[PDB]
Amino acid sequence: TVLKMTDLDLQGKRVLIREDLNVPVKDGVVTSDARILASLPTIKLALEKGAAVMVCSHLGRPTEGEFSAENSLKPVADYLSKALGREVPLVSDYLNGVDVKAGDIVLFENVRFNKGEKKNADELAKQYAALCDVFVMDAFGTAHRAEGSTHGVAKFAKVAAAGPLLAAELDALGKALGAPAKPMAAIVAGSKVSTKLDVLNSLSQICDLLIVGGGIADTFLAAAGHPVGKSLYEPDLLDTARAIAAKVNVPLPTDVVVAKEFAESAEATVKLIADVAADDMILDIGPQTAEHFAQLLKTSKTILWNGPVGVFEFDQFGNGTKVLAKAIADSAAFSIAGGGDTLAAIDKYGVADQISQISTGGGAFLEFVEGKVLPAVEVLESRAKA
């Protein structure tokens, strides 16, 4: 339970809003704005509520204590000025005081230039908190970090609350992971079981079908005694995968698309799983597997989508993910999706409108799926109780 900015009285109050404005930038220009688009209703509501608004965010992982022009938020100030129809100044020196009136908005320079940001320094947290009456955390994609402007500031601000976007992401994730409508399917892909072990084990206690992809799928295929050829798997994790497959239904591919190499002389071939050669690379699920998986997805009432099932930027290895994306788009289930490759797949196959919730903050998304405490949410919950 956290305080909500929407439930607050903000008229004439100085409001520091931590947004996730960490967008691609090239040559001083924003080249994609999904994170900014998502945050703008928060910014607009605070202004409508009578606030003096200070927006802050990170950009990249610059060196603390230096100005790095490539990491400056000036392109986001340019963008916000055109989006809001008003000059939105970038404020490059603010920890010692900033002049902002009710009804106005400024954009702080990159919080990660500040010495003490990454390690959550009290001195820095207190300087943030001194600039405002209310601190609002609205950046779910950084909620897994205890940093000066994501966590420390909320220790010391007079009032500390969640923003509308943070609350909405916690709600949707709570919907999919708290007690989901059954049956619940999860798709988890990646290069290694070991690197997503916490995700897999958590979902094993939550979902009813666990569709694995990529190198995770190779280890499950190996653990079942299937040949995976020249495809990455972890022999040491074989017992773990078998334990996971004992806890939850993990359907395995019945057919796959293989190639020996990426070359103009190579052909992409569908084989049954038993016929994978020792020099074949497993690069997509096969058409029978894709049909079976699609039928499973359209029977589910909840879908967690965390990964493609093939190297889909190659069309010869894209059928599995195309079919699965379309199935999720057609399915009656509440679907949530997260992870960079997943969003790329959603964009490529044009199903974004048909996904119930698309999380843009991968790392914090996975931590929430794993059952981890999110420090940014934790500090908000402690403030509310006290």
Structural domain spans, the chain: 1-163+373-386, 164-372
The annotation status of 145 as a binding-site residue, yes or no, is yes
Cis-peptide into 183, omega within 30 deg: yes
Neighbours of 48 (CB within 10 A): 11
The answer to the question of whether 85 is labelled as a binding residue is no
CA dihedral 294, 191, 355, 35 (to 10 degrees): -170
Intrachain domains 1-163+373-386 and 164-372 with the same fold: yes
**Which residues make Cβ contacts (< 8 Å) with residue 128, sequence separation at least 6?**
16, 56, 95, 135, 148, 149, 152, 153, 156, 157
Q: Are 247 and 229 contacting, i.e. CB atoms less than 8 angstroms apart?
A: no
C-alpha pair distances (Å), 249 with each of 223, 242, 243, 244 = 14, 11, 11, 9
In sequence order, what are the residues at sequence separation of 6 or more whose Cβ sits closer than 8 angstroms to the Cβ of residue 360? Answer: 20, 34, 35, 38, 141, 343
Q: How many CB atoms lie within 10 A of CB 75?
A: 20
22 is annotated as contributing to ligand binding: yes
Q: Is 383 annotated as a binding residue?
A: no
Angle 296-299-197 (CA atoms, 0-180°, nearest 5)?
Answer: 50
| Residue 86 annotated as lining a ligand binding site | no
By C-alpha distance, which of 213, 219, 229, 178 is closest to 323?
Answer: 213
342 annotated as a binding-site residue: yes
- CATH 3.40.50.1260 describes domain 1-163+373-386: yes
> Do the strands 209-213 and 29-30 form a parallel or antiparallel pair, or are they unpaired?
unpaired
Which class is domain 164-372?
alpha beta
Q: Is 116 annotated for ligand binding? A: no
The tokens of 31 are what? 């080249």
What is the three-state SS of 332-366? CCEEEEECHHHHHHHHHHCCHHHCCEEECCHHHHH
- 312: closest CA among 364, 348, 362? 348
18 known ligand binder: no
- The answer to whether the annotation marks 138 as part of a ligand binding site is no
Helix/strand/coil for 299: helix
In this structure, what are the phi and psi dihedrals at residue 361, rounded to the nearest 5 degrees? -105, 75
Contacts of 222 (CB under 8 A, 6+ apart): 228, 233, 235, 238, 241
Annotated binding-site residue? 242: no
> Residue for token digits 């405490």?
373
Q: Is 21 annotated as a binding residue?
A: yes
Task: Tell how far CA 183 is from the center of its chain.
Answer: 23
Classify the C-alpha dihedral 286-288-289-295 as positive or negative.
positive
**Resolution of this PDB entry, in A?**
2.1
Question: How does DSSP classify residue 139?
Answer: -
Q: Which residues are catalytic?
A: 35, 192, 340, 363
Query: Dihedral sign, CA of 145, 148, 150, 153?
Result: positive
Q: Is 60 annotated as a binding residue?
A: yes
DSSP string, 72-115: -SHHHHHHHHHHHTS---EES--TT-----TT-EEEE--GGGST
Q: Using N-to-C axis directions, what is the helix angle for 238-247 and 197-204, rounded to 10°? A: 20
Annotated ligand binding at 292? The verdict is no
Token readout for 212 is: 């694995």
